[PDB]
């Protein structure tokens, strides 16, 4: 499986999830099962935690190719979480069994997608650039913010989500958007 788009809407009111199953000839039997949303408070290593933020079952929406593609637009204010200072973790699962000719490693039933609001980072960069316009000196806080973002990106890409949570809570938690 894979994500088509996974972002918070530009108006900071919806959390957009658009999932699809991969198009190979050996995934015809594989469908989509459920979508589970977790935050930086409830996240756990081994799969979605108990008491998640938002559980979604795909059978309910549809009445077979329809179940291979799913799109959602979750009003974040209905989830009772802050769109500015929240790190959503989106798990997806597959109610299927791939063929026997599946190459080794491609039969991964679960995926994960981390979401943050990019608006506060954009505004912070604009503030730092405005400060740079005065006397053409780069603030050290600006380089710090850039490198801390790169650290969180590396933590996400290597799968080390808890240390990414520590960095996010410690460095980027207070955000205005």
């Amino acid at each position: 499986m894979h994500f088509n788009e996974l972002r918070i809407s530009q108006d900071n009111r919806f959390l957009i999830i658009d999932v699809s199953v991969d198009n190979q000839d050996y995934f015809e039997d594989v469908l989509l099962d459920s979508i589970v949303i977790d935050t930086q408070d409830t996240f756990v290593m081994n799969g979605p935690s108990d008491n998640p933020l938002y559980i979604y079952n795909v059978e309910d929406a549809y009445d077979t190719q329809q179940m291979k593609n799913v799109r959602l637009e979750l009003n974040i204010q209905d989830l009772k979480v802050s769109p500015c200072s929240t790190m959503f973790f989106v798990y997806v699962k597959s109610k299927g069994t791939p063929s026997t000719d599946t190459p080794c490693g491609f039969d991964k039933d679960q995926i994960l997608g981390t979401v943050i609001n990019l608006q506060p980072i954009y505004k912070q960069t604009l503030k730092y650039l405005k400060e740079v316009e005065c006397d053409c000196n780069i603030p050290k806080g600006f380089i710090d913010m850039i490198l801390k973002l790169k650290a969180i990106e590396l933590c996400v890409r290597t799968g080390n989500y808890p240390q990414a949570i520590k960095y996010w809570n410690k460095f980027f938690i207070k955000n205005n958007c």
Binding site: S34, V36, G47, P48, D50, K93, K95, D109
Partner: peptide, 19 residues
């Protein structure tokens, strides 16, 4: 965790191996 349905089938299946 979030157990899938097939996992519960797997667990009962493996328990009834020792039937």
């Amino acid at each position: 965790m979030f157990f899938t349905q097939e996992d519960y089938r797997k667990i009962e299946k493996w328990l009834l191996a020792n039937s």
